[PDB]
Specification:
The complex is a heterotrimer, with 1 copy of chain A (10 residues) and 2 copies of chain B. Chain A is largely without helices or strands and 10 residues long. Chain A has no helices and no strands. The termini of chain A are far apart. Chain B is α/β, with parallel strands linked by helices and 448 residues long. Chain B has one domain (1-448): Alkaline Phosphatase, subunit A, CATH 3.40.720. In chain B, the strands form 4 sheets. Chain B has a 10-stranded mixed beta sheet with strand order 7-8-6-5-12-1-13-17-2-18, sandwiched between helices. A 4-stranded antiparallel beta sheet of chain B has the order 10-15-16-14. In chain B, strand 15 and strand 16 form a beta hairpin. The two termini of chain B are 30 Å apart. The chains are: A little secondary structure (10), B alpha/beta (448). At the B-C interface, helix 1, helix 2, strand 2, strand 4 and strand 14 of B face helix 1, helix 2, strand 2, strand 4 and strand 15 of C. Chain B: Its EC number is 3.1.3.1.
Chain lengths: 10, 448, 449
């Protein structure tokens, strides 16, 4: 959900 | 009697002559028997090396020690095996054959499979105690060491329970882990829960999140760094501060934050590029000058942790993680990738040297997943980023990662290497599951 | 004190629950001690499976047995470790980090490193006795089995000494291995030497080459197949013919040629393609129709080989390779790859079921050299050649190869998995070198230099 995520963002 | 740890398994002679490349000078049966003991374990030191699978170990050995070389730490454990690390689909509960760090770390620290991203919770977002909390509940000292951010998955899995590994501090938890947010009745973000866990020794990077202020609770309004201080922690920032520490226990728990993000890498080098192996000169890795004497190394933090935790008669549990690497500046960086394995090898040596003379310590060395980087022929014909390196053998070795630059290296689901030394080390031999590691540790220390 | 084989190391229960994914049910210290013995080995069965590597085994297990599955043969061996397989650069004598099949095969069959392509010789092109030749001189029966062509590296290293693996027969040998060419005073081509070696049992593919005629020698003018019949071999070409065999020895040695090239793959599926995990649909392997009861399986050949070699009271040496795969039609083919691991597990089971009740047999399982197969996340990013597969768990598994279509899968220098069972099994545990396996088998059987 990071590894690396998508999103985890703005 | 005494349990030995392979002294030397380097090519024994002339690799050009018959029997010259042998690593064994004789039968090993006796050695293996001497390595097997069902005696109780007073302590446990768990060394985890990020992405350090067989390919990673081989590459580092070829480069730093020569193909026929030998890691007096990593290749030194007598008992060996391969374990599975698959995760679960959160909706279906079916396997999802490529795990992430969070789920992997949750597996060995709690013993339950879960979904990629989850930390200390199953697929029902239900909490589960960690080997570390259990150790504390038995009066054992506890240590959580890592060259990465203490909020990253590996060290966090031991002290935090959130629905997403992203939830580093208040800000991030408020939006991605609402049910965990403090101001919503939750147990709080990863950092807040780390301060609650209260391990005797916690050392590493990740001081950035500690700049955040709590949005609720007893310490609402002040920085998490200020909170640790108000709660009696011994805050240390560098090597000099760390060394001056004489004790670490529940009244004076040690918290060492040595870098905003991850701790400095050991080696530097250009990154692999398309056709790098032929279109760019062969590389020789250079030391990271940012490696000050003022910033403890993975090995030194292990030493200090052992010193502090050994003063507890009942015993202790310590987890050391060597993963100063990042994403993508370090990245698809062989130089940075190799120096990282050397970092772990040093830490493992200290652990084995301690465990050997103490005789009641179980040292377990493993990785969380394999990286798809690989050692290929100088004349590779395959697509991807490559780099040639000058090894200790005076020959070149080429490396290639199957990821898109402007993309981080991917995971794989391949079962991977785990080795152990000491009491109960047998339980890592053969095929086992990553969750078996939780149970192996639990049983070795006799925790309920 | 009988040496145990792991009965069941599959997840013990509900993998969604605490401890449900556990593969152990209790302490193993006792199990391990009982798995250690330095008593001499009467026989040795060395199973070699391309893709008996950690990544290929996990993929196959996930596929056929589910993530929580358990290979009753492959995962059943108690003692495991890793071994390096680097080669030597013929010119400099220095290491070459990624070895080809021949350098690798030479290493464990003779105990000496060598250059890539080299079969049964060192960097000075000087012959070195193989493990099979040595067991021969000690009076033990010998078996050489492979689902590939018998001339191919693996089965060839045990009975042939040539400066290049390509030297299958006369023609090729004459143009690529002049020094080994018969008409030049050499020991001949791979097949010719294989025939001089005269193992008690040789089962595999590659009947193509035996159709070649010798260029010199007392058997000049006739096909190698004919030369074989003239020299006393029992020629068998299918399951029925092979089952009819009652004995195999030096007076009546057995030679089974079951396919023109490699023996038929167990499962069919399409080749992996770029972005095939999204581009194409999830794949489920299908039985290869070319595989029938007239073609023995890797398992039956192993089974029959053990039967015939087990008669020799002195003991026997047997090597079994599961490599029915090719290059590139089978290729970047997930199903062909997994089916092989599956074929392998059956042959390993027979080997273990046998060694378990005899108690003096060392079973060793290992994986070729390293390849680029990988299990990756089932979302967009692949890359290379990829393919989504429907597994036993009713979940899809994605795999990527990273070599190029219109290019065969590449080799890697990554240390590989090795496991053993029986006397001296301990010698594979922990870190060892591929050449150590030679000294391990030689020592276990008591063979003299």
């Amino acid at each position: 959900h990071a590894t690396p995520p998508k999103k985890e963002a703005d | 009697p005494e349990m030995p740890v392979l002294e030397n398994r380097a090519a024994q002679g002339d690799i050009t002559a018959p029997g010259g490349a042998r690593r064994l000078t004789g039968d090993q049966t006796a050695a293996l028997r001497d390595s097997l003991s069902d005696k109780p374990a007073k302590n446990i030191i768990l060394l985890i090396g990020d992405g350090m699978g067989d390919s990673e170990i081989t590459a580092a050995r070829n480069y730093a020690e020569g193909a026929g070389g030998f890691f007096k730490g990593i290749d030194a454990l007598p008992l060996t095996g391969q374990y599975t690390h698959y995760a679960l689909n959160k909706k279906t509960g079916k396997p999802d054959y490529v795990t992430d760090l969070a789920a992997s770390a949750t597996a060995w620290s709690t013993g339950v499979k879960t979904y990629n991203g989850a930390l200390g919770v199953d697929i029902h977002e239900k909490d589960h105690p960690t080997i570390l909390e259990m150790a504390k509940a038995a009066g054992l000292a506890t240590g959580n060491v890592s060259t990465a951010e203490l909020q990253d998955a590996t060290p966090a899995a031991l002290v935090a329970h959130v629905t997403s590994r992203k939830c580093y501090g208040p800000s991030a938890t408020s939006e991605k882990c609402p049910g965990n947010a403090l101001e919503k009745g939750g147990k709080g973000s990863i950092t807040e829960q780390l301060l609650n866990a209260r391990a005797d020794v916690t050392l590493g990077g990740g001081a950035k999140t500690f700049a955040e202020t709590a949005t609720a609770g007893e310490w609402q309004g002040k920085t998490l760094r200020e909170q640790a201080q108000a709660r009696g922690y011994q805050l240390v920032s560098d090597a000099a501060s760390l060394n001056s520490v004489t004790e670490a226990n529940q009244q004076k728990p040690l918290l060492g934050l040595f870098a905003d993000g991850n701790m400095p890498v050991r080696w530097l080098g250009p990154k692999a590029t398309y056709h790098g192996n032929i279109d760019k000169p062969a590389v020789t890795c250079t030391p990271n000058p940012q490696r000050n004497d003022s910033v403890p190394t993975l090995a030194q933090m292990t030493d200090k942790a052992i010193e502090l935790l050994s003063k507890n008669e009942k015993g202790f549990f310590l987890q050391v993680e060597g993963a100063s690497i990042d994403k993508q500046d370090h990245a698809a960086n062989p130089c940075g990738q190799i120096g990282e394995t050397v970092d772990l090898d040093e830490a493992v040596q200290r652990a084995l040297e301690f465990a050997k003379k103490e005789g009641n310590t179980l040292v377990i060395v493993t990785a969380d997943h394999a990286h798809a980087s690989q050692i290929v022929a100088p004349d590779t014909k395959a697509p991807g980023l490559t780099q040639a390196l000058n090894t200790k053998d005076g020959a070149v070795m080429v490396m290639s990662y199957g990821n898109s630059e402007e993309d981080s290296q991917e995971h794989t689901g391949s079962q991977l290497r785990i080795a152990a030394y000491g009491p109960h080390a047998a339980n890592v031999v053969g095929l086992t599951d990553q969750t078996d590691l939780f149970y192996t540790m639990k049983a070795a220390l006799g925790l309920k």
